[PDB]
Design an enzyme around this catalytic site. Structure first.
Site, PDB file in Angstrom:
ATOM      1  N   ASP A  33     -10.762  11.894   4.155  1.00  0.00           N
ATOM      2  CA  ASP A  33     -11.153  10.532   3.733  1.00  0.00           C
ATOM      3  C   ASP A  33     -12.057  10.704   2.529  1.00  0.00           C
ATOM      4  O   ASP A  33     -13.206  11.146   2.685  1.00  0.00           O
ATOM      5  CB  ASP A  33     -11.870   9.710   4.827  1.00  0.00           C
ATOM      6  CG  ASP A  33     -12.462   8.377   4.283  1.00  0.00           C
ATOM      7  OD1 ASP A  33     -12.032   7.980   3.178  1.00  0.00           O
ATOM      8  OD2 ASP A  33     -13.345   7.740   4.928  1.00  0.00           O
ATOM      9  N   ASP A 222      -9.158   6.508  -2.511  1.00  0.00           N
ATOM     10  CA  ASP A 222      -9.595   6.520  -1.117  1.00  0.00           C
ATOM     11  C   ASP A 222      -8.473   6.999  -0.225  1.00  0.00           C
ATOM     12  O   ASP A 222      -7.554   6.241   0.091  1.00  0.00           O
ATOM     13  CB  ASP A 222     -10.062   5.142  -0.664  1.00  0.00           C
ATOM     14  CG  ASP A 222     -10.490   5.165   0.772  1.00  0.00           C
ATOM     15  OD1 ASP A 222     -10.643   6.289   1.290  1.00  0.00           O
ATOM     16  OD2 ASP A 222     -10.702   4.099   1.369  1.00  0.00           O
TER      17      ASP A 222
HETATM   18  C1  LIG Z   1     -14.005   0.792  -0.718  1.00  0.00           C
HETATM   19  C2  LIG Z   1     -15.136   0.623   0.213  1.00  0.00           C
HETATM   20  C3  LIG Z   1     -15.152   1.718   1.199  1.00  0.00           C
HETATM   21  C4  LIG Z   1     -13.782   2.229   1.481  1.00  0.00           C
HETATM   22  O1  LIG Z   1     -13.171   1.123   2.031  1.00  0.00           O
HETATM   23  C5  LIG Z   1     -13.785   3.268   2.581  1.00  0.00           C
HETATM   24  N1  LIG Z   1     -12.358   3.412   3.040  1.00  0.00           N
HETATM   25  C6  LIG Z   1     -12.146   4.472   4.020  1.00  0.00           C
HETATM   26  C7  LIG Z   1     -11.985   3.971   5.477  1.00  0.00           C
HETATM   27  C8  LIG Z   1     -12.062   5.087   6.527  1.00  0.00           C
HETATM   28  C9  LIG Z   1     -11.374   4.765   7.849  1.00  0.00           C
HETATM   29  C10 LIG Z   1     -12.091   4.361   8.934  1.00  0.00           C
HETATM   30  C11 LIG Z   1     -11.469   4.049  10.121  1.00  0.00           C
HETATM   31  C12 LIG Z   1     -10.111   4.129  10.250  1.00  0.00           C
HETATM   32  C13 LIG Z   1      -9.359   4.522   9.217  1.00  0.00           C
HETATM   33  C14 LIG Z   1     -10.012   4.820   8.037  1.00  0.00           C
HETATM   34  C15 LIG Z   1      -7.891   4.603   9.370  1.00  0.00           C
HETATM   35  C16 LIG Z   1      -7.077   4.529   8.112  1.00  0.00           C
HETATM   36  C17 LIG Z   1      -5.975   3.512   8.207  1.00  0.00           C
HETATM   37  C18 LIG Z   1      -6.339   2.022   8.259  1.00  0.00           C
HETATM   38  C19 LIG Z   1      -7.175   1.433   7.137  1.00  0.00           C
HETATM   39  C20 LIG Z   1      -8.391   1.960   6.833  1.00  0.00           C
HETATM   40  C21 LIG Z   1      -9.187   1.477   5.840  1.00  0.00           C
HETATM   41  C22 LIG Z   1      -8.729   0.397   5.143  1.00  0.00           C
HETATM   42  C23 LIG Z   1      -7.508  -0.189   5.389  1.00  0.00           C
HETATM   43  N2  LIG Z   1      -7.049  -1.264   4.712  1.00  0.00           N
HETATM   44  C24 LIG Z   1      -7.900  -2.292   4.459  1.00  0.00           C
HETATM   45  C25 LIG Z   1      -8.012  -3.179   5.627  1.00  0.00           C
HETATM   46  C26 LIG Z   1      -9.381  -3.238   6.208  1.00  0.00           C
HETATM   47  S1  LIG Z   1      -5.677  -1.448   4.308  1.00  0.00           S
HETATM   48  C27 LIG Z   1      -4.936  -2.194   5.546  1.00  0.00           C
HETATM   49  O2  LIG Z   1      -5.100  -0.239   4.093  1.00  0.00           O
HETATM   50  O3  LIG Z   1      -5.594  -2.217   3.196  1.00  0.00           O
HETATM   51  C28 LIG Z   1      -6.752   0.353   6.402  1.00  0.00           C
HETATM   52  C29 LIG Z   1     -10.458   2.095   5.603  1.00  0.00           C
HETATM   53  O4  LIG Z   1     -11.432   1.399   5.321  1.00  0.00           O
HETATM   54  N3  LIG Z   1     -10.726   3.378   5.660  1.00  0.00           N
HETATM   55  C30 LIG Z   1     -14.613   2.678   3.579  1.00  0.00           C
HETATM   56  O5  LIG Z   1     -14.046   1.788   4.254  1.00  0.00           O
HETATM   57  N4  LIG Z   1     -15.920   2.892   3.775  1.00  0.00           N
HETATM   58  C31 LIG Z   1     -16.739   3.814   3.103  1.00  0.00           C
HETATM   59  C32 LIG Z   1     -18.214   3.612   3.380  1.00  0.00           C
HETATM   60  C33 LIG Z   1     -18.543   3.701   4.802  1.00  0.00           C
HETATM   61  C34 LIG Z   1     -18.940   4.718   2.795  1.00  0.00           C
END
Ligand SMILES: CCC[C@H](O)[C@H](NC[C@@H]1Cc2cccc(c2)CCCCc2cc(cc(N(CCC)S(C)(=O)=O)c2)C(=O)N1)C(=O)NCC(C)C
Length: 367
Positions: A33, A222
């Site tokens: 990630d 990401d």
């Molecule tokens: C850009 C800001 C941060 C970035 O988003 C970053 N993305 C990575 C995260 C990590 C994650 C956590 C939990 C579960 C997963 C993965 C499984 C991956 C598949 C589903 C998924 C995940 C994310 C995100 C999605 N999608 C968005 C829907 C909420 S989707 C459906 O693909 O568009 C699907 C997502 O946010 N994974 C984040 O969320 N946070 C970072 C801070 C904590 C430091």
């Protein structure tokens, strides 16, 4: 190196890597990630995961004395911040001493169909929790293995959510995992892996949107985000452009699939999408083009697909669905993200993505 095909997974639920943790080693599967920079594992049990990490049964574990909560765009969790020894069978064979969070409460973090049971954050320390002192997994490997400050992914699961995987190369590049030349865009801020998106071109047709809206907050690479998220009204324009080639209904919003007898491929009914990114010199730029194969996702004599772009509120995320088309290099030492064609990204042995450059350039597009 031995690090090829060390990953395993699809774009639907993620790509993970087998890690050995503690003394003796507990065999865990760790999601890779680039959207976060915390390393964490499931310290108590749960239903979608089948193995967890037992801190009692690891003598090389030590607890740091505090808990931490991490909230992502999907789910959150809270865990003890310890440290322990970690070994990645593939590529190193050596034990490393790394901070680690053991999760004892997770809300909407462990989803159905995940094959992994922790997460590995490969982003800059800026995003670490509870602060920037927690040293990232990869920062430790750099400092402890005197490897270069470089990692590079390759995801070959461009099919349908057994699942073939890809490679995570720590320490640099593996030149059998790409073909051609590499284009480097610079890292605009070494927190997320934020890059500078200059244009979006939907099937030859530039978007009318201002250049500035594409980097509205951030435009990041990401590996943890499955899809290509777009700022809401950028998404809307993008949706209209794709729709025009054929507003506000189920397939686009993902509440429906479209299904084709296996013989017909809908991809030709859609257009190539191009992201134009800045080259390392201002004057130049380049474009990474994902064809419909990458964003029309198939999820047996018929096949049933989903529109693989969703809308974001603040940030623009080049998720794994965009990253599957290419070999991605995260050169932290020269502050750049490298892109190149990926040989394994070839359904039916044809190229599902293209990369082209150079081009002539607004003055700055990151607010
Ligand atoms: C850009 C800001 C941060 C970035 O988003 C970053 N993305 C990575 C995260 C990590 C994650 C956590 C939990 C579960 C997963 C993965 C499984 C991956 C598949 C589903 C998924 C995940 C994310 C995100 C999605 N999608 C968005 C829907 C909420 S989707 C459906 O693909 O568009 C699907 C997502 O946010 N994974 C984040 O969320 N946070 C970072 C801070 C904590 C430091």
């Amino acid at each position: 190196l031995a690090m090829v095909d060390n990953l395993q997974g699809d774009s639907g639920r993620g790509y993970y890597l087998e890690m050995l943790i503690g003394t003796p080693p507990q065999k865990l599967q760790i999601l890779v990630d680039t959207g976060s920079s915390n390393f964490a594992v499931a310290g108590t049990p749960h239903s979608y995961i089948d193995t967890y990490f037992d801190t009692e049964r690891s003598s090389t574990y030590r607890s740091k004395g505090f808990d931490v909560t991490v909230k992502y765009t999907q789910g959150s969790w809270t865990g003890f911040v310890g440290e322990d020894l970690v070994t990645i069978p593939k590529g190193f064979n050596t034990s490393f001493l790394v901070n680690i969070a053991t999760i004892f409460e997770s809300e909407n973090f462990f989803l159905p169909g995940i094959k992994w049971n922790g997460i590995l954050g490969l982003a800059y320390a800026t995003l670490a929790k509870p602060s920037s002192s927690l040293e990232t997994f990869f920062d430790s490997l750099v400092t402890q293995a005197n490897i270069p400050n470089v990692f590079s992914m390759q995801m070959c699961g461009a099919g349908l959510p057994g699942t073939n995987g890809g490679s995570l190369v720590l320490g640099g590049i593996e030149p059998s995992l790409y073909k051609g030349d590499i284009w480097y865009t610079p890292i605009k801020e070494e927190w997320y892996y934020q890059i500078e998106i200059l244009k979006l071109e939907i099937g030859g047709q530039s978007l009318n949107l201002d250049c500035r809206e594409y980097n509205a907050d951030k435009a990041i690479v990401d590996s943890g985000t499955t899809l290509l998220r777009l700022p809401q009204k950028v998404f809307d324009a993008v949706v209209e452009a794709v729709a025009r080639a054929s507003f506000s209904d189920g397939f686009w919003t993902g509440s429906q699939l479209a299904c084709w007898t296996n013989s017909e491929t809908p991809w030709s009914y859609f257009p190539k999408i191009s992201i134009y990114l800045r080259d390392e010199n201002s004057s130049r730029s380049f474009r990474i083009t994902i064809l419909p194969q990458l964003y029309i996702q198939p999820m047996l004599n018929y096949e049933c697909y989903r529109f693989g772009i969703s809308p974001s509120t603040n940030a623009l995320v080049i998720g794994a669905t965009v990253m599957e088309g290419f070999y991605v290099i995260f050169d932290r030492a020269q502050k750049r993200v490298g892109f190149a064609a990926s040989p394994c990204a070839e359904i039916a042995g044809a190229a599902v993505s293209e990369i082209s450059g150079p081009f002539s350039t607004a003055s700055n597009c990151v607010p």
